[PDB]
Amino acid sequence: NDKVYENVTGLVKAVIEMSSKIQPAPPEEYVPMVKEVGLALRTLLATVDETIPLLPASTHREIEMAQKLLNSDLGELINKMKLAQQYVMTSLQQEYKKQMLTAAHALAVDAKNLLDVIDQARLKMLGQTRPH
Ligand SMILES: [Zn+2]
Numbered sequence: 719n720d721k722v723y724e725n726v727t728g729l730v731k732a733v734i735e736m737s738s739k740i741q742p743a744p745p746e747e748y749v750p751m752v753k754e755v756g757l758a759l760r761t762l763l764a765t766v767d768e769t770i771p772l773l774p775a776s777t778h779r780e781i782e783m784a785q786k787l788l789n790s791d792l793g794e795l796i797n798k799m800k801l802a803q804q805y806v807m808t809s810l811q812q813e814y815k816k817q818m819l820t821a822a823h824a825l826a827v828d829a830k831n832l833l834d835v836i837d838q839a840r841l842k843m844l845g846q847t848r849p850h
Pocket residue numbers: 731732735754
């Protein structure tokens with residue numbers, strides 16, 4: 719029920735959408751799908767930034783690296799999309815589209831890991847407060 723949880727769920731659903739839809743899709747159709755995955759990521763990353771000030775200092779780094787990795791899954795997905803758009807109406811089409819899928823799949827997996835690191839940081843956070 720937390721904003722981080724919601725943003726991850728959003729980002730994963732955009733990935734599953736694009737995934738189930740990309741086989742029979744022209745660039746016209748799959749650019750927007752990548753555009754949606756992109757902003758859902760940007761949104762999650764903004765939320766995680768607003769969250770770090772509440773998590774223990776000792777967890778900052780693990781979380782920061784998890785965000786870097788998502789940022790380059792995006793970069794990797796965007797690159798595979800550019801290439802699919804270049805080799806449209808050819809037989810490098812399917813190959814590049816399959817590479818987009820892989821890259822989106824990585825992004826979803828890395829989003830969940832980030833959720834898991836933030837969740838564990840929150841648990842460690844409970845073990846820290848002072849009396850009233
Ligand atoms: Zn959607």
